[PDB]
């Protein structure tokens, strides 16, 4: 079912939080691109409860997929969200 760890997200005019509660083999894939492309996808991996990506520009639509890990598998769906930079 769904047992993905909640997580809060954050959207600023250049920055992408996502915030969940650190347990000891729970981890975190997040990746940022523009819907129309221009610049680089970035990936960041984490287990510290917090994943940061910064250097967004203002006023762009981002398509942004989390994956949940598990022991460093994909075990749950990827989640696929759009978001357009205040």
Do not use: H
Not at 10 to 30: C, D, N, Q, S, Y
Not at 38 to 48: C, F, I, K, L
Request: aromatic share 6%.
């Amino acid at each position: 079912g769904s047992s993905i760890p909640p997580y809060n997200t954050e959207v600023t005019e250049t920055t992408i939080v996502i915030t969940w509660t650190p347990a000891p083999r729970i981890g975190f894939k997040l990746g940022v691109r523009p819907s129309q492309g221009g610049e680089a996808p970035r990936e960041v991996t984490s287990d510290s409860g917090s994943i940061v990506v910064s250097g967004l520009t203002p006023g762009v639509e981002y398509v942004y997929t989390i994956q949940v890990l598990r022991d460093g598998q994909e075990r749950d769906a990827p989640i696929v969200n759009k978001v357009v930079t205040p």
